[PDB]
């Protein structure tokens, strides 16, 4: 009997990937293609939508070709899931099927002025005014503000609106449009919760905000769950349709951070995950009911398996410099050269012995939202070494997540039961130990590291009946994909010293303007 | 007649040199011999005074013997000058002519408890209570608290005192006693100003202070100028009378920092010198009347040519971590490897792009005495690099000296005229330019950088008629020895911003206890 496979498009900030999974939840074929990171003005970032689409189809046709060399009795993929960098917004025309301009990216800062024009003229000052509707504060990140900026500052967008041709879309929507030939204009609830145009509880567009923010709802896609029929792959860009060999349904769509939650099996309330990439995104599943935030955290959709399946919600927090800190220490400061020296140097000392290092190189986020904070070290003596500084960096990442989790527990009214961790810094043993001690929960480290791409494939597979239930999903995961477990081992008194010391350091970090 | 030669004994903390200078102020023969650093308990440091005496003597014989080989016009040394690590205190017996113990060194900390007692019981809790007599605060450095400690803790010393055979003396006193056979029990004004027993205004021992501190005046040597006949070399230790050949008078004695003030030609009020060593010692000639400091700067005697000749007073400030910071950056943090790269990396960026590095590794000194301050860096971004950090360390050193100078100008009622520089860290071209720019004066860098030894040689040679006036000395320097002049090359707008950022940074440095 023949292996069924499920494809996952992982459309990230810096690259695109197609991972083909089998029924074991094993990546059996992968391919990656990068796209250009345009930076026209300092603080701006922008992607070519056609470069992304092409990257995605190039990825698919290559991975398929490789899989069929290792399984010549293959023939088709059961379904395809999409997961994506969120918030990043693309505008296109619906007759040409072509982008009107380059897509500003989640962390672009051009929408700043509009951030403020909005908060004042609509919010009556309160940045969290619309938050009980959307889940989100007003920031540069969210899609609506980028939709707005384009409408205001892009000739071809301004026009295309008046002509009744304008389509807006997060990357999922863009992928699904172009992948289906123009046939589907859709989004999923996770991506939709990032627009600042969607009512969290109801998971439908808010006409208040659309007409309030100057956004014609004719320019907005239909919302669905993460797990159902969205469309079929109709295009043929890089022989993609021919390589699929049968008409293939797109049955999965889910934002990248939620995809990692789902992919690490964080299905029940209290279960949470952290992705240590360049930064950190921590997400906690908080149950079937939406929770909102006294400490400036985000409230968002975790996932919804099926049209009127239950919708799980989550809280979300972030640190801006995690992996970037470690890389900064080698590339900027020459504190080590090979990647494994970081943990090696940090273990070589017993502690930080007085120093604290707050790696707030582009501000504190999270529950102490402070853009004036900069990178800071205190307590050095002539005994301090690069080893102490590196250890101190790792403690500091952990200490930020500690404060984030503290916040989520009070805003959610639950305990964190366990913490799943993925990303480059997932592989730093000492960091996961310090992390476990501070939170006082186990940190599970998946050795099938591809968990973001897995999330989308699970949504796709659940909808195509490759997996029948979440328990079948969890069970296959346990048979097939191992994990290291990192238990806490601190002591109430040490933790308190570390946090007290940390709390004093934070007061000395304010610096810019 | 023939070529004249003056010799200089430079008795430092870690070694002793003998430099022979010719009439052009050229060092023509040099030898160096170390002496043992005994540390009985942490924070304690002690020198073997007989080892010091022998080193000086070996230094002399070797330097002279080398010079006879390399210079057929060298007949004898016209006179010898002495310069010394100040404060270090020797106790010895006037009949055995030997020490009663090792000599606690200037940076020795065993006098800490005696220091707290003196403040509380003699000064009502004011450390500055005697500072209008001595120009000094109560501190572990000064000679009187070391005497006091030897009586209270050394049975032999207390014994010798009981028997009327006790001689206390700073290193100048000890060297002139031993070099003369035991016939001279003298000290120059500059070293005496470092005892906490001398009255700045009279340049005599202060009966009140000796009585209040219970150092019998009988134990102290006679106070003389820096330049006059102290006596004659008579010992034949290490063949030194053999090497000198003829009768050689000792005609110069002056404390090391002051010697550098003198050797740098700072003969007028408003002329200052800075030594850029492990730390920095900055002195300014304040003119013929003492100036007391409303900023914790120390008031001291600059110099005095001739028994009851005009006496030039000085203000003194220190920084603890100068070249030590350069060294920490290399040895502890791996920011560069060869010392040339320090200046190269700092040159490679136009400024510090807003970071400040306060290297208060061992507290803050200068006019912000704060032993709780620790090493700190603020303001970093992911654009910051080691080049920025190295350059900030250099800026930090110049900013401290800018604050010290500023304090001096307010205490003295005068402008800084120019700054002569020496020490290893004055080979750093960029540190010199930053310093000209911040201070708005020319920085003169002697090519003949042996300024400390030259002070003593000048005192001696003036007294011997090798040079007949301060103006002849200045001319000879100019005609014979290269001075490099470093003019300001900054803007007053940058200066201002650098200073404002320095001030903000200093507020963030408090950490210890
Ligand atoms: N236990 C299994 N049952 C069925 N097919 C398998 C099994 N293990 C591997 N495969 C198949 O072999 C091909 C390559 O898979 P891969 O995991 O790279 O194999 P390996 O485990 O030898 O590295 C895929 O088609 C995959 O589905
Ligand atoms: N050529 C050079 N360039 C830059 N820095 C130097 C150079 N040579 C020595 N240094 C640094 O300057 C300091 C020189 O100190 P030094 O003058 O030797 O000690 P002291 O404090 O006893 O005068 C050292 O700490 C060293 O790091």
Nearest partner of B75 among B244, B321, B191, B313, judged by Cα: B244
Q: Please give the C-alpha separations between residue B210 and each of B89, B100, B118, B160, B507, in angstroms, as whole numbers.
A: 16, 21, 13, 18, 40
Which residue bears the tokens 């991972």?
A: A19
Half-sphere exposure of A270 (CA within 13 A, CB side): 8
Residues B150 and B193 in one domain: yes
* Domain boundary residue, one of B199, B230, B264: B264
- Rounded CA-CA distance A434/A384 in Å is 20
Token pair, residue B41, equals 């308990």
What sign for the dihedral angle of Cα B173, B122, B43, A381?
negative
Question: Which atom of ligand 1 has the smallest separation from the CA of A23?
Answer: 27
- Rounded CA-CA distance A447/A426 in Å is 10
Residues B244 and B352 in one domain: no
Instruction: Consult the annotation and say whether B86 binds a ligand.
Output: yes
Q: At what angle do helices A256-263 and A451-464 cross, to 10 degrees?
A: 80
- Rounded CA-CA distance A309/A306 in Å is 5
Nearest partner of A423 among A278, A263, A258, judged by Cα: A278
Kindly list the residues of chain A whose beta carbon comes within 8 Å of any beta carbon in chain B.
321, 324, 328, 332-336, 354, 361-362, 374-382, 384-386, 389, 508-509, 511-512
Residues A279 and A161 in one domain: no
Does the beta-carbon distance from B389 to A321 stay under 8 Å?
A: no
- Rounded CA-CA distance B341/B112 in Å is 40
Buried-exposed string A202-214: b where 16+ CB fall within 10 A, e elsewhere: ebebbeebbeebe
> Starting at the edge strand that comes first in sequence, how are the strands of the sheet with A375-380 ordered?
A356-359, A375-380, B375-380, B356-358
Structural domain count of chain A:
2
Nearest partner of B18 among B66, B87, B50, judged by Cα: B66
3-class secondary structure, A462: helix
Provide the 8-state DSSP code for A112.
H
Residues A169 and A290 in one domain: no
- For the beta carbon of residue B46, count every other beta carbon within 10 angstroms: 18
- Which phi and psi (to 5°) does residue B495 adopt? -40, -50
How much distance in Å is there from the Cα of A455 to the middle of ligand 1? 20
For an interface test with A, the pick among B279, B325, B331, B332 (most A C-beta atoms closer than 10 Å) comes out as B332
Contacts of B48 (CB under 8 A, 6+ apart): B35, B36, B38, B99, B102, B103
Burial class of residue B242, CB neighbours in 10 A (0-12, 13-18, 19+): exposed
* A324 CA: distance to closest CA in chain B (Å): 8
- In B, which residues are within 8 Å of A389 by CB distance? 333
Residues B114 and B13 in one domain: yes
From B424, B428, B429, B430, mutation site for ligand 2 pocket: most ligand atoms within 8 A of C-beta: B424
Instruction: Consult the annotation and say whether A162 binds a ligand.
Output: no
Q: What is the largest CA-CA distance in chain B?
A: 70
3-class secondary structure, A140: coil
Contacts of B475 (CB under 8 A, 6+ apart): none
* B315 CA: distance to closest CA in chain A (Å): 28
DSSP codes of every residue in B160-207: HHHTT-EEEEEHHHHHHHHHTTS---EEEHHHHTTTT-EETTTTEE-H
Does the beta-carbon distance from B324 to A382 stay under 8 Å?
A: yes
Residue A201 CA to its chain's centroid (Å): 21
Nearest partner of A198 among A114, A87, A296, judged by Cα: A87
- Which phi and psi (to 5°) does residue A426 adopt? -50, -40
Token pair, residue A250, equals 């797109």
Find the residue in B nearest to A512 (Cα).
B379
CATH number at residue A302: 3.30.420.40
Kindly list the residues of chain B whose beta carbon comes within 8 Å of any beta carbon in chain A.
321, 324, 328, 332-335, 354-355, 361-362, 374-382, 384-386, 389, 504, 508-509, 511-512
Residue pair A56/A11 in contact by the 8 Å Cβ criterion? yes
Residues A239 and A271 in one domain: no
- Strand-pairing partners, residue A188, are A224
For an interface test with A, the pick among B42, B322, B329, B334 (most A C-beta atoms closer than 10 Å) comes out as B334
Does the beta-carbon distance from A374 to B361 stay under 8 Å?
A: no
Q: End-to-end CA distance of chain B: give it in Å, rounded.
A: 66
Buried-exposed string A410-446: b where 16+ CB fall within 10 A, e elsewhere: ebbebebebbbbbbbbbbbebbbbbbbbbbbbbbbbb
Token pair, residue B117, equals 């007692």
Instruction: Consult the annotation and say whether B87 binds a ligand.
Output: yes
Residues A252 and A271 in one domain: no
Q: Which helix (H) or strand (E) holds A388?
A: helix A386-412
Pairing of strands B79-84, B249-255: parallel
- For the beta carbon of residue A31, count every other beta carbon within 10 angstroms: 19
3-class secondary structure, A252: strand
Instruction: Consult the annotation and say whether B257 binds a ligand.
Output: yes
- Strand-pairing partners, residue B494, are none
Which residue bears the tokens 């010719």?
A: B22
Burial class of residue A492, CB neighbours in 10 A (0-12, 13-18, 19+): exposed
| HEC per residue, B399-452 | HHHHHHHHHHHHHHCCCCCEEEEECHHHHCHHHHHHHHHHHCCCEEEECCCCHH
Token pair, residue A129, equals 């005014």
Residues A83 and A215 in one domain: yes
* A255 CA: distance to closest CA in chain B (Å): 27
Token pair, residue B467, equals 């040079």
Give the Cα-Cα-Cα angle A410, A415, A419 (nearest 5 degrees).
120
- For the beta carbon of residue B287, count every other beta carbon within 10 angstroms: 18
Token pair, residue A344, equals 């090696």
- For the beta carbon of residue B191, count every other beta carbon within 10 angstroms: 31
Residue pair A357/A333 in contact by the 8 Å Cβ criterion? no
Which ligand gives the minimal distance to the CA of B274?
2
Nearest partner of A103 among A40, A177, A170, A47, judged by Cα: A47
- Rounded CA-CA distance B72/A260 in Å is 87
Nearest partner of B18 among B467, B473, B464, B450, judged by Cα: B450
Token pair, residue B431, equals 């540190």
- Rounded CA-CA distance B375/A384 in Å is 9
- Ligand 1, CB within 6 Å, residue ranges: A 3, 22, 26, 28, 70-71
- Which phi and psi (to 5°) does residue B261 adopt? -55, -40
Residue A180 belongs to domain spanning: 1-264
Q: At what angle do helices A49-70 and A171-179 cross, to 10 degrees?
A: 60
3-class secondary structure, A424: helix
Q: Please give the C-alpha separations between residue B179 and each of A259, A332, A391, B87, B237, in angstroms, as whole numbers.
A: 86, 56, 55, 20, 9
Q: End-to-end CA distance of chain A: give it in Å, rounded.
A: 66
* Domain boundary residue, one of B232, B264, B296: B264
Residues B249 and B277 in one domain: no
Residue pair A235/A97 in contact by the 8 Å Cβ criterion? no
Reported structure resolution in angstroms: 2.4
Does the beta-carbon distance from A375 to B376 stay under 8 Å?
A: no
Residue pair A442/A435 in contact by the 8 Å Cβ criterion? no
What sign for the dihedral angle of Cα A340, A343, A347, A348?
positive
Residues B195 and B325 in one domain: no
Residue pair A447/A488 in contact by the 8 Å Cβ criterion? no
* Domain boundary residue, one of B203, B234, B264: B264
- Strand-pairing partners, residue A485, are A444
3-class secondary structure, B344: helix
Find the residue in B nearest to A336 (Cα).
B334
- Which phi and psi (to 5°) does residue A145 adopt? -55, -35
- Which phi and psi (to 5°) does residue B258 adopt? -65, -35
Buried-exposed string B49-72: b where 16+ CB fall within 10 A, e elsewhere: bbbbbbbbbbbbbbbbeebeeeee
3-class secondary structure, A373: strand
* B360 CA: distance to closest CA in chain A (Å): 8
How much distance in Å is there from the Cα of A28 to the middle of ligand 1? 7
Q: Whose CA is nearest to atom 23 of ligand 1?
A: A28
Give the Cα-Cα-Cα angle A298, A201, A190 (nearest 5 degrees).
55
For an interface test with A, the pick among B325, B374, B391, B396 (most A C-beta atoms closer than 10 Å) comes out as B374
Residues A332 and A343 in one domain: yes
Provide the 8-state DSSP code for B122.
I
- For the beta carbon of residue B448, count every other beta carbon within 10 angstroms: 18
Residue pair A60/A439 in contact by the 8 Å Cβ criterion? no
Pairing of strands A222-224, B418-422: unpaired
Residue B284 falls in which region: left (phi positive, over 0), alpha (psi -120 to 50) or beta:
beta
From A6, A22, A476, mutation site for ligand 1 pocket: most ligand atoms within 8 A of C-beta: A22
Q: How many residues does chain A have?
A: 513
Question: Which atom of ligand 2 has the smallest separation from the CA of B14?
Answer: 22
- Rounded CA-CA distance A246/A487 in Å is 47
- Rounded CA-CA distance A387/B475 in Å is 53
Token pair, residue A98, equals 């072509």
- For the beta carbon of residue A37, count every other beta carbon within 10 angstroms: 11
Instruction: Consult the annotation and say whether B123 binds a ligand.
Output: no
Pairing of strands A418-422, A271-276: parallel
Residue pair A254/A226 in contact by the 8 Å Cβ criterion? yes
3-class secondary structure, A5: coil
Residue B176 falls in which region: left (phi positive, over 0), alpha (psi -120 to 50) or beta:
alpha
Which residue bears the tokens 């990439």?
A: A277
Token pair, residue B126, equals 């004011």
Experiment used for this model: X-ray
* A406 CA: distance to closest CA in chain B (Å): 26
Residue pair B32/B17 in contact by the 8 Å Cβ criterion? yes
Nearest partner of A148 among A181, A123, A115, judged by Cα: A115
3-class secondary structure, B501: helix
Does the beta-carbon distance from B389 to A333 stay under 8 Å?
A: yes
Q: Please give the C-alpha separations between residue A115 and each of A43, A170, A234, in angstroms, as whole numbers.
A: 15, 19, 38
- In A, which residues are within 8 Å of B502 by CB distance? none
Provide the 8-state DSSP code for A94.
T
Instruction: Consult the annotation and say whether A256 binds a ligand.
Output: yes
Nearest partner of B64 among B242, B243, B249, B237, judged by Cα: B243
- Rounded CA-CA distance B211/B220 in Å is 13
Pairing of strands B46-47, B103-104: antiparallel
Token pair, residue B202, equals 């009279």
DSSP codes of every residue in A189-236: HHHHTTTT-EETTTTEE-HHHHHHHT--GGGSPEEE-SEEEEEE----
Which residue bears the tokens 């002056």?
A: B254
Residue pair B104/B111 in contact by the 8 Å Cβ criterion? yes
Burial class of residue B378, CB neighbours in 10 A (0-12, 13-18, 19+): buried
Nearest partner of A219 among A178, A149, A165, judged by Cα: A165
- Rounded CA-CA distance B357/B339 in Å is 19
Which ligand gives the minimal distance to the CA of A64?
1
Token pair, residue A324, equals 């970037």
DSSP codes of every residue in A362-377: T-B-TTS-BTTB-EEE
- In B, which residues are within 8 Å of A382 by CB distance? 321, 324, 328, 332, 361-362
- Which phi and psi (to 5°) does residue B225 adopt? -70, -170
Nearest partner of A13 among A211, A277, A212, judged by Cα: A277
Buried-exposed string B79-103: b where 16+ CB fall within 10 A, e elsewhere: bbbbbbbbbbbbbbbeeeeebbbbb
Half-sphere exposure of B209 (CA within 13 A, CB side): 25
Token pair, residue B33, equals 């011999």
- Strand-pairing partners, residue A311, are A304
- In B, which residues are within 8 Å of A500 by CB distance? none
Instruction: Consult the annotation and say whether B194 binds a ligand.
Output: no
Token pair, residue B216, equals 């019998």
Residue pair B372/B413 in contact by the 8 Å Cβ criterion? no
Pairing of strands B37-38, B222-224: unpaired
Burial class of residue B343, CB neighbours in 10 A (0-12, 13-18, 19+): buried
3-class secondary structure, A171: helix
Residues A286 and A348 in one domain: yes
């Amino acid at each position: 009997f023949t292996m069924k496979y499920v494809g996952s498009i992982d459309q990230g900030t810096t690259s695109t990937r197609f991972i083909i999974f089998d029924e074991r939840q094993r990546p059996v074929s992968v391919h990656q293609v990068p796209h250009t990171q345009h930076t026209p003005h300092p603080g701006w970032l922008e992607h070519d939508p056609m470069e992304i689409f092409r990257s995605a189809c190039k990825c698919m046709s290559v991975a398929i070709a490789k899989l069929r060399q290792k399984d010549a009795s293959f023939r088709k993929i059961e379904a395809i899931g999409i997961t994506n960098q969120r918030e990043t917004t693309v505008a296109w025309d619906r007759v040409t099927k072509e982008p009107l301009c380059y897509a500003p990216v989640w962390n672009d800062l051009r929408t700043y002025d509009i951030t403020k024009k909005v908060t004042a003229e609509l919010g009556g000052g309160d940045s969290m005014f619309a938050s009980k509707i959307t889940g989100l504060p007003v920031s540069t990140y969210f899609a609506a503000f980028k939709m707005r900026w384009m409408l205001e500052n892009v000739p071809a967008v301004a026009d295309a609106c008046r002509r009744g041709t304008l389509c807006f879309g997060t990357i999922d929507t863009w992928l699904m449009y172009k992948l289906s030939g123009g046939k589907a204009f859709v989004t999923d609830v996770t991506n939709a919760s990032r627009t600042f145009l969607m009512d969290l509880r109801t998971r439908k567009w808010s006409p208040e905000l659309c007409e309030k923010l100057k956004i014609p709802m004719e320019t907005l896609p239909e919302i669905r769950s993460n797990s159902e029929l969205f469309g079929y792959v109709e295009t043929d860009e890089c022989g993609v349709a021919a390589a699929l060999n049968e008409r293939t349904p797109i049955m999965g769509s889910i934002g990248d951070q939620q995809s990692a939650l789902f992919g690490n099996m964080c299905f029940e309330k209290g279960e949470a995950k952290n992705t240590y990439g360049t930064g950190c995104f921590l997400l906690m599943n908080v149950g079937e009911e939406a929770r909102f935030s006294k400490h400036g955290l985000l409230s968002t959709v975790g996932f919804q398996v099926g049209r009127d399946g239950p919708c799980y919600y989550a809280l979300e927090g972030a640190i801006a410099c995690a992996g970037a800190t470690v890389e900064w220490m080698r590339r900027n400061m020459n504190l080590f050269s090979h990647i494994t020296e970081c943990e090696k140097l940090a273990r070589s000392v017993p502690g930080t012995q007085g120093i604290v290092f707050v790696p707030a190189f582009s501000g504190l986020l999270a529950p102490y939202w402070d853009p004036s904070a900069r990178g800071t070290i205190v307590g050095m003596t002539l005994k301090t070494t690069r080893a102490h500084v590196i250890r101190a960096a790792l403690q500091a990442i952990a200490l930020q997540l500690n404060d984030v989790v503290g916040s989520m527990k009070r805003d959610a009214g639950l305990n964190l039961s366990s913490l799943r961790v993925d990303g480059g810094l997932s592989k730093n043993g000492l960091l996961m130990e310090i992390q476990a001690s501070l939170l006082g929960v186990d940190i599970l480290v998946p050795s099938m590291h591809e968990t973001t791409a897995l999330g989308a494939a699970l949504c796709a597979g659940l909808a195509a009946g490759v997996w029948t239930s979440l328990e079948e999903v969890k069970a296959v995961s346990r048979r097939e994909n191992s994990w290291k477990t990192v238990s806490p081992s601190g002591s109430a008194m040490e933790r308190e010293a570390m946090i007290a010391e940390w709390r004093e350091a934070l007061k000395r970090t304010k610096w810019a303007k």
